[PDB]
Amino acid sequence: MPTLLRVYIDGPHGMGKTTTTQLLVALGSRDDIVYVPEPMTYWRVLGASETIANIYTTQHRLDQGEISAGDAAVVMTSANITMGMPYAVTDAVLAPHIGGEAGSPPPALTLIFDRHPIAALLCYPAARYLMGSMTPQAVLAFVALIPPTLPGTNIVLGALPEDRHIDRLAKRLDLAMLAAIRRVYGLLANTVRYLQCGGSWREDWGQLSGTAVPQSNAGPRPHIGDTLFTLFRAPELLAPNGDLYNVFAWALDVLAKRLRSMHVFILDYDQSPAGCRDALLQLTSGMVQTHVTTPGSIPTICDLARTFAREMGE
Amino acid sequence: MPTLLRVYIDGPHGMGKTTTTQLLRDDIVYVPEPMTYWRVLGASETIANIYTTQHRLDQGEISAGDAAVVMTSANITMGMPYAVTDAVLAPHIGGEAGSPPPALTLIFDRHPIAALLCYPAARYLMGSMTPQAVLAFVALIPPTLPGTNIVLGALPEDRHIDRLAKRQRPGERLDLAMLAAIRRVYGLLANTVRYLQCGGSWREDWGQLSGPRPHIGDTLFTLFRAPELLAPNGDLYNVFAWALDVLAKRLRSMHVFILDYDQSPAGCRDALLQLTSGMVQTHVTTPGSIPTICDLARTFAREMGE
Ligand SMILES: Cc1cn([C@H]2C[C@H](O)[C@@H](CO)O2)c(=O)[nH]c1=O
Ligand SMILES: Cc1cn([C@H]2C[C@H](O)[C@@H](CO)O2)c(=O)[nH]c1=O
Description:
Chain A: This is Thymidine kinase. 2 copies of one chain form a homodimer. By secondary structure, chain A is an alpha/beta fold. Chain A has helices at residues 17-27, 40-46, 51-64, 69-94, 117-130, 136-144, 162-169, 175-196, 201-204, 246-260, 273-283, 297-312, and strands spanning 3-9, 34-36, 98-101, 109-114, 154-159, 263-268, 290-292. In chain A, helix 1 crosses helix 11 and helix 3 runs antiparallel to helix 4 (69-94). The two termini of chain A are 33 Å apart. One thymidine binds at residues 13, 52, 55, 80, 83-84, 115, 119-120, 124 of chain A. One thymidine is lined by residues 13, 52, 55, 80, 83-84, 115, 119-120, 124 of chain A.
């Protein structure tokens, strides 16, 4: 059976993920590498009217004190359903074709995705919770809906000094949001690593008590205060005993299950587009490939990707 | 390895699902309605907010767009406990056992599809939710594990209205339009499983909606013929078509059983218990899966069901 290499490029917006990814696709043979792009058209038209604008306008309104935190959360929660739709539908139709993990000879097909389901089911929500525009309950609700992690889930997150990032981003201008999203993804990288080194949130929960003070596949085990777990020490989720309600505890259990088997890689975006491209292309060497389930899975996957790209990525 | 029997009691609210499961020490556990999560843990009085917003919309006090945001947002809270529970329980489910008594029997008050498909679909028919939001929920429906036995209810509308009147939840408003919508959605749901099990292919029969199983117009597929989901030439956009493909996959392997609720509580209880004979049991994955499942159930019940 042919082998497949799925690679999800994710991380804070504005680092050059899109530019880079296409440079990567450009180099490959026409048909042995397909790109599932950002579904902009679904966010601006198909699923709803100008979703990105509504998000930014609401955060701005909230900041100005024109609407309440509750009003903002409803809007943000609702908008996040639209933002994550295409990732979730694509994951559900693609899953059946993924077989077991083959190994780190060239893959018959290579699927480059612009973001992974967790961007919308974990990362953006958590960032919005840090911005005060989303409840911690809604965040964990999204987390509980994260699809089972299939074998060969290779994710690439990005590295970029904040000044370089601000610069690159700056052509609404929300630097607090940029910081938030930056912290969320840092935490995420630490969380996979924490999970892969044996970290048990239930065992280290007691080590959290405090406030706010990154590698994904290298280094020692991070302190739980440096992982996504710290975010959920919110008073809304805590009971009279001081411990988390089980509903939320189970959601953190889901979070750990989902992130422990993922393969995370860091791409240094502080270089030219071609550098990033050559950079990303060299990381593919250590990513895990998987077998497809049917002999005709390759073409089906190709159709899906092209159709997705044509209908939703511009 | 011990065998487990999972039974999800679902259907429109107000038929007596709860009474019947209550009436029906350690070889059968009940995962109840997570009322406390809906009223306190996840958010403040979620059922009230739902009914108030439908009522406000009806009065013309807010727009259809405003209603959908609130409705979409609230549906996240309503389905949270079912989704979290499904996610932690899945790992313990093994393959099917067969067509002797099961070591453990899990009775649930509703299945993830009530909040991930049925309520949203009904609110769409009520004008308080977009068809895009509905399919977004459908796309998140957890993979259907083996032994997914779901019991839906049968009850004449007059008997239902009559009964609904008295079991009004905290914040609920007696809405007959909403009752009809939810009744239709579940009727369609039942037909859809059957359609799917008999070979029905929505892509092949889609044309009959604009031109020995049910007709596609009697399944959930009819609801997604909404103009919002179609391109200028009438075609369903692929994003939505894929969502329908997820819907068929999820519902085809489900085991649906109809319980007649037009009878006394003990009648229903026995009725339900006689239906368990044809439900599919599965093996658990670890030897210590039973107790873990028991803990889960009890803890869920204690923390969220009152
Ligand atoms: C993926 C995703 C992106 N975004 C934002 C980041 C950028 O502003 C823009 C491009 O992805 O959208 C969200 O707000 N939510 C999401 O789930
Ligand atoms: C499960 C669920 C229930 N409900 C409502 C219907 C009834 O008011 C009550 C069910 O006991 O809650 C929703 O509005 N949405 C859902 O997803």
